[PDB]
Amino acid sequence: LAVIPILVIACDRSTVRRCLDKLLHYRPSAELFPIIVSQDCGHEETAQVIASYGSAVTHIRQPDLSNIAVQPDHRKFQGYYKIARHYRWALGQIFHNFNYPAAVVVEDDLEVAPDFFEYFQATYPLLKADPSLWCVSAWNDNGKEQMVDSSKPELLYRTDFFPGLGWLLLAELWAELEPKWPKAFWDDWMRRPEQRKGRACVRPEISRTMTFGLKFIKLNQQFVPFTQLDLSYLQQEAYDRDFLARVYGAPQLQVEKVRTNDRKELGEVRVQYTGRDSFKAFAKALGVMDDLKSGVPRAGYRGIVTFLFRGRRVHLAPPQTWDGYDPSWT
Numbered sequence: 001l002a003v004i005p006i007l008v009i010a011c012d013r014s015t016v017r018r019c020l021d022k023l024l025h026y027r028p029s030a031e032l033f034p035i036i037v038s039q040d041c042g043h044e045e046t047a048q049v050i051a052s053y054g055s056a057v058t059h060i061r062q063p064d065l066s067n068i069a070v071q072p073d074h075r076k077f078q079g080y081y082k083i084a085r086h087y088r089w090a091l092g093q094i095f096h097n098f099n100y101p102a103a104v105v106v107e108d109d110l111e112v113a114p115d116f117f118e119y120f121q122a123t124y125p126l127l128k129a130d131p132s133l134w135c136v137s138a139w140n141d142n143g144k145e146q147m148v149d150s151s152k153p154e155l156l157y158r159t160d161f162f163p164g165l166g167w168l169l170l171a172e173l174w175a176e177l178e179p180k181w182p183k184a185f186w187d188d189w190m191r192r193p194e195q196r197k198g199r200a201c202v203r204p205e206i207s208r209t210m211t212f213g214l215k216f217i218k219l220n221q222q223f224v225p226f227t228q229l230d231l232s233y234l235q236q237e238a239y240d241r242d243f244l245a246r247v248y249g250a251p252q253l254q255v256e257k258v259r260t261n262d263r264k265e266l267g268e269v270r271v272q273y274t275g276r277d278s279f280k281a282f283a284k285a286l287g288v289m290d291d292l293k294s295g296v297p298r299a300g301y302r303g304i305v306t307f308l309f310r311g312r313r314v315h316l317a318p319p320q321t322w323d324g325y326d327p328s329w330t
């Protein structure tokens, strides 16, 4: 077992209480999962709420509350500049001042699943061992109830789309990102290829975080003992052979046949897309997120979006000749 801090990003919402109450209720050990609450903004009521938890958490305060000079295209986005400054300061605190080896980053509007800690404890060794991974996330971007298999709460995947929303990173990655941290829109900046460098994140079939106060993502409620499972299938070499053979070995169905629930005997199928317009159209037809960041679809892996549709496993996939993302798919 390893020590992994939880870094909570807070500011001016008193409801950080709900976030902390759930983290503290499910935390298995204070020693294994120290909680550090970084509060920006100087909102007095929120500070009093965090302080009331005492030694159960460590309360740190972003020091520079000044307004930030924004570029000419960003007059409406001061808040995004402040968020980026806060993340830079808080992550620096976690990795430089506290000297932790990794951290799970969570925002104050997230509620955790019962197995949130078990999940990160089990996946941290994979992140440490596989250089092709750069994070573990608790979030399934297409995680609404009707799109996930409730009988497979233990199932995990690789994704090229950095989901944020409860994510684990190594101190080594902060060393790489810190020198070029952006002025604003930090998460979309991490999604650019110049930052991602082809690396993936682990993500679950059923989300381990949910937002409150995205609202339709289902929070897992069945505890899965991930530390007792064999997660070797997530190693790049095994995954890229087996999961891909599975996707391309599955029968192909036209999107309208999947939409209307035709050929129900086929419990796992592939819907093939061929260009940006067909991807957007097919994703919309099947109720899957259709937006792309730097050409990567939500929850996509080698261009493949996997989800459940009317109880059937569906892989919305490009032709197997796929060889990289095109950022122009906007």
Ligand code: MMC
Binding pocket: 008, 019, 020, 023, 106, 107, 108, 109, 110, 111, 112, 166, 209
């Ligand atoms: C997870 Hg707050």
